[PDB]
Structures are given as C-alpha cells and as structure tokens.
Amino acid sequence: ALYEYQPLQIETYGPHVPELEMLGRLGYLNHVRAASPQDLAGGYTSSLACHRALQDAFSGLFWQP
Amino acid sequence: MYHNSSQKRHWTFSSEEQLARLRADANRKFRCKAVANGKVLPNDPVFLEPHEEMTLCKYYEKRLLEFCSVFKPAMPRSVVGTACMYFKRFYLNNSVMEYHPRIIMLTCAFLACKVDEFNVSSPQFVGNLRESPLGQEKALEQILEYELLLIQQLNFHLIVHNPYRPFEGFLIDLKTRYPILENPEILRKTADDFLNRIALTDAYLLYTPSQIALTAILSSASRAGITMESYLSESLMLKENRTCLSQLLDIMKSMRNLVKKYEPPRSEEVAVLKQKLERCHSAELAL
Amino acid sequence: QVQLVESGGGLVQPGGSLRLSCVASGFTFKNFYMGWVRQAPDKGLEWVATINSGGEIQSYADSVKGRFTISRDNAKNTLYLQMNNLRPEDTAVYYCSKQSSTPAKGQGTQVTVS
Amino acid sequence: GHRSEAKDGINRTALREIKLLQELSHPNIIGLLDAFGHKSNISLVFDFMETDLEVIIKDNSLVLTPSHIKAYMLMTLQGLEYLHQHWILHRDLKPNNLLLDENGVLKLADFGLAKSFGSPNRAYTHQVVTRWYRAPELLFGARMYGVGVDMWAVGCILAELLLRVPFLPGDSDLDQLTRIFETLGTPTEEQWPDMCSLPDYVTFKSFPGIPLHHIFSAAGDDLLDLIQGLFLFNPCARITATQALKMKYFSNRPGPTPGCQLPRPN
C-alpha cells in the first residue's frame, strides 16, 4: 500500500477558523502587531499570533457539557 | 487546544448543583474523619458549614488576585487565571478545615508560575510576601509541602485554558469582518471588567473559555447600547445551525446570571469564619 | 554563466494584477528552490515567496499571503509570480532569487502601484 | 529567565512532560501511563518501547532500505504535525528521542524541552535542541521562533538516516555554525534577509558549501527535494511538517515499509 496525505480531522466544536492564506488577503493581519525584523529572523511571524488567537477564540464555542 | 483538553474532559461540569454536591461531600468527609478520631462530637460547632467554606474561598481568592497584581516581577495574566483555576478545583473535593486556604492559594500561584513558564526563583516568589525573612522562609517550606498534594488533587491535569487569548481572537475577528462595530476596541475596558467579574464565580468550571470571552464582549456591547446579533448569525454563521445559536444565547444568559447573583464575602463574616477556621486547625482534628 | 532575467513589471492601479517572469540560465533550474524577493526604497530586503524544486509546495510572506501565487515551469526554466489585489505598499523592485546553495539574483523588475 | 533547585520543589522539566503529555493523544507520540511523587520528587511512566532510532542507526548489521527510511520519516513527521497543530514545539528532536515499540510504531519521546508557541508576549530560550541538531537561528540567539527549530532537527535526523553518522557534529556553538555553513554554504541576505538582527548573530566567512547530491549520493530527486526544504536557511520559508508530508517523496513508488516489517536491532 502506497501513502497519500490525509489531513488530521479533529472536532473543534466551534466556528470555522479561516485558512492561513485568508488571514492575509482578508486583512486579519492588519489587526495584529507586525513582526519586527528580529522576529522574522527567527521564524516568528504575525500570522502565528493571529492564527492561534483565532483558533483559541473559536475552540469549544459550541460545546456544552 | 481546549476542544480536546483535559479541562474540557474532566473539569467542566454541567450544573452548579454538581459543584455544590462535590463541595458538601468534601465537608462531610472531613467531619466523619474528625469525629472518627474521637476528639470531637458529630455536631461540634467547630465544624464549618459548606456555605462557610465558600465564603472563606471567595476571600482567599480575592487575596490571591491581590497578591498577583502586586507581584514584583510583573506576573502574566495567564499565570493568575491558572492559579485561580487550581484554587477552585482543589476545594471542590477538599475541605478548608483540613488544608488551610492561605497555604493552598500560595501553592496554586507557585505551581502556576511553573506550569505557565513564568520563571521566577523561590526567593523571588516568597519575596513578594510582606513578612520578615524569617517568615518568608517558613511560607516557602509550607508551599513545598503542599506542592505534590495540589498536583494529586488536580489529577495531574495542569494545563488551564483561560479566556484571555480567546478574547483577543474575537477582537481580531471583530476588527476584520464586523465593520458595523466601528472600532471594536471601545469594548475592551468594560468587557475586561465583566471578564474579571465572572472570574470570581464558578463560570470557569461551567463554561468554555471561548464562551466566557464572547459573553464579556457582547455584554460590553450591550452596556454601550450596541446591537451585534448579526455577528453571531451572519459573521459566525449561526443562521445555519439555529439550535447552536439558541444554546449559545442561553449559555451567555446563564453566565450573566451567575454574575448578577454573586455575593461578595462580607468583612465581618470573614473575621468570624477565619477565627473558627483557625481554631479548627489548632485543635488538629486530622489525628 | 548563471543568469536570471526578470520581466513583466510596470505601473498598475490599486487592486490590479500583474504576473512577473524570470528566465533562468547557466544552471540546472529544476534542481533548486527558487523564490522572489523585493526591495522598496529606504527599506530593507523583504522575502516574498519560495517554491520547491518539484513545485508542489509554496511559502509566502505575511504581507502577500492570499494575494500572490508563485509557480514554476521547469521545462521552460521560468519562474512566475502572480500578483493580485496589488496595494501601494507592494511597490518595490522585484528580484528572482536562487533560494538554495550558491546564491543567485537577477537584475530586478520594477512594480509600481499608484 | 530564572529558577534554581533544591528549594524550588518539583522539577520543572518533569512538570513539562506531565502538563503537555496529559493533553496529547496520538499513535506517534509517547503516552504517559502513570505519574506519582513524594516530597517534591516525581516519577513518570510511559509506554514500554523496545528500541530507539539511534541504536538502529548505529547497528552496522542493520541495512536501511529506502522504504525503511521513508517509514521512519513518515511516522516522525506525522507525530510532529500533530504536535505543531496543537501549538507545541518539541525542541529536542534527535534519534535518541524517537522510540519504536515491538510493532514498528515510532513515537516522539523526550518532552523535557517541549513548550507551547505562537504567543507574542512570551520570550523563548535559544539554548534548546541538542547542539548537533540545532537550527542556525537558535545558534544566533533567537528568542522568538517557530516550527523551524523542529524541522531543522528533522533534516539532521534524515541526514543521519542516510549517512549512518552524525551529519553536523559540532564541538561548540561556534563550531556547530561553522559546520553548518561550510557544509550547506553561507546564506546571503536574499536567502535570510533579517538574519543580521538576531541577538547572537556572528558574521562568518562565505563558504560555497557542498552540493546536496554529492553529500547524499544515494538519494533521488524527490528525496533531495525533501532534504533541501528542511535545511532552508530562512526559518519562515523552511518547510513545515504538513508541507513535508505533501511532497512527492512520501507518495512515490518505493513506498514505506509497514511497521511489522521494520528491522529490529541486534
């Protein structure tokens, strides 16, 4: 059997987090602090902060014990 | 992540009554243990009532909030919410009569500084206690004695999800997709106060951090007289799943009612209960 | 001799589109990660996009994420940069770059968004 | 940055393993079976594993086929993709920390240096990842970074899979940097623009490097493509675990050896 990539499917119980490319063209990144060149030099970008905040905000929004 | 977290799986409960039963259960077990040791009678008035343990926990929780706000190395907010979460979880199944809330609230903050990776040394931590260097060392010894006990009573579930990052996530989404609200930053002040209010209730044990954060924002918008039901139906696309829109609206109403019926601990009542609690420990009912 | 020849620049209005080309010669274009970099006046170099040798994966800077699309034709030894919804802050000289091993950069093509 | 020992109570490294592994469940990540303590001492119990990847690499009698190497890399990247999707960096990837059970299931193991990432308000230790596998941005003192600190180590593990020997065995932090640059070439500003802004950045002589196909004579174009993406100097352009799994190397014909058929060391 050969391999083919399957994305990991985990229920978040919340709204859809925008895809990484939507963060740029829809302007999500305009509302997070811009990464300084010293940050970009190590690999840290503003899309990391924006993406995690978006995921934590939507995670479990619709989950009721 | 929260949606598969131990916090959601084991430390998010369905009702206030379930919380009250667990706390009353811890109170009753200590009474049985104390009476079994043959020092006290089944209804000696030295025992605290479940509602009296709660009043003392509200008090020492505010003292824990006050301790963190003056912590010399500026303490990140996520350390404080983690410490308060530990404090709530510990006395869900333990009695203030057996483990003193003064020592436990410091152990919660001490453990939270390690879990959240807020690296302060032990002398830096107890140095924030306004006591003599003789007493600051005594407090450190007691913290290290209750440290393992706290982790055991948490079932070794240490990661706590706070509503602070979810709060920022909604603001990003508000600023990006909801132009109806011109400048979403006006709500931060009042939503932050509303967020601090629910932190004193049992909402951390009853709702997801995302729902808590959205409640604080929408409540602040209600205070500012701003309609944003379209943010839920249109922007969050809850027009499609009406049952999920209904549940979420009920959760936010339930949370706002939790804050409406919050009773702050009265200073005179605390003085009496601290006196009774101190007598309970000095008699050493454990053995 | 190695050589990268950019083309396709010009004046575009805000919201417009442009595709840049880069013809590679002097080296085995198919065997190297290629990319685009840009430099605006009074501003340092800014990485834009990179594509692998096979072409099936791409990485983009935050400033161009969702608007630009990098691609390559290994048979024609050309590198492409599709630019959509161009903003005034995208104005810079754009350079084709060999993103791995021995460095290489072309002369650059000017993209101006008014 | 602060701490100490002996009067701080329970070991912070053990708390890292507890707090993180208590929230994770994946076939390619070690499972925490038990935890217990006594007077600020702590003990952890994990899944029973048979061997790790380092003894497999060091076994001269063991022959590593292309299908074997593809299977090890597939399981490593699958567990790492799960890790990064939960916003956790491992920060100590090496063959020592890749364990295999009796069924050929590879699991990421030592989480004593693992830490969550993505938050702009947190500073990160740059003295992480075992030196031989440490990314150049960490050697340059980066206090804010991302998944590249794991992907660079994955490249060094794959290189140790192919060479059966440590790829970049530096004696010190500066010697590790010389070996990185004299082997892979020194990056120019077009390949790492803001590189000079790093706190511990040091300027090196411009080395041309060795071509990848000379370093790895036994690797095809698809495998060379994967290696090249893991060792990109730009930490923002360096491929992610998800991007690595989507490359043609893993879906190409040789295919991965099943777990039950992976070699068992002597």
Author numbering:
A (entry chain C): 244 to 308
B (entry chain B): 1 to 287
C (entry chain D): 1 to 114
D (entry chain A): 46 to 311
What do the authors of the reporting publication say about this deposited model?
Here we determined, at 2.15 Å resolution, the crystal structure of the human Cdk7/Cyclin H/Mat1 complex with the kinase doubly phosphorylated at S164 and T170 in the T loop. For structure determination, we reconstituted the tripartite human Cdk7/Cyclin H/Mat1 complex comprising Cdk7 (2-346) and Cyclin H (1-323) in complex with a C-terminal fragment of Mat1 (230-309). Doubly phosphorylated, fully active CAK complexes were crystallized in the presence of ADP•Mg2+ and a chaperoning nanobody, VHHRD7-04. Two Cdk7/Cyclin H/Mat1230-309/VHHRD7-04 heterotetramers constitute the asymmetrical unit cell of the protein crystal, exhibiting a high overall similarity at an RMSD value of 0.28 Å over 624 Cα atoms. The nanobody VHHRD7-04 interacts through its complementarity determining regions (CDRs) mainly with the C-lobe of Cdk7, with some minor contacts to Mat1. The canonical pT170 residue forms salt bridges with R61 of the 56NRTALREIK αC helix, R136 of the 135HRD catalytic site motif, and K160 of the 155DFGLAK substrate interaction motif. As a result of this intricate salt-bridge network, the αC helix is pushed toward the active site of the kinase and the DFG motif is in the “in” position, indicative of an active CDK. The second, Cdk7-specific phospho-site pS164 is buried in the tripartite complex formed with Cyclin H and Mat1. It forms a salt bridge with R165 of the second cyclin box of Cyclin H, which in turn is in a linear arrangement to form another intermolecular salt bridge with D299 of Mat1.
Cyclin-dependent kinase 7 (Cdk7) is required in cell-cycle and transcriptional regulation owing to its function as both a CDK-activating kinase (CAK) and part of transcription factor TFIIH. Cdk7 forms active complexes by associating with Cyclin H and Mat1, and is regulated by two phosphorylations in the activation segment (T loop): the canonical activating modification at T170 and another at S164. Cdk7 directly influences progression of the cell cycle by phosphorylating and hence activating cell-cycle kinases Cdk1, Cdk2, Cdk4, and Cdk6.
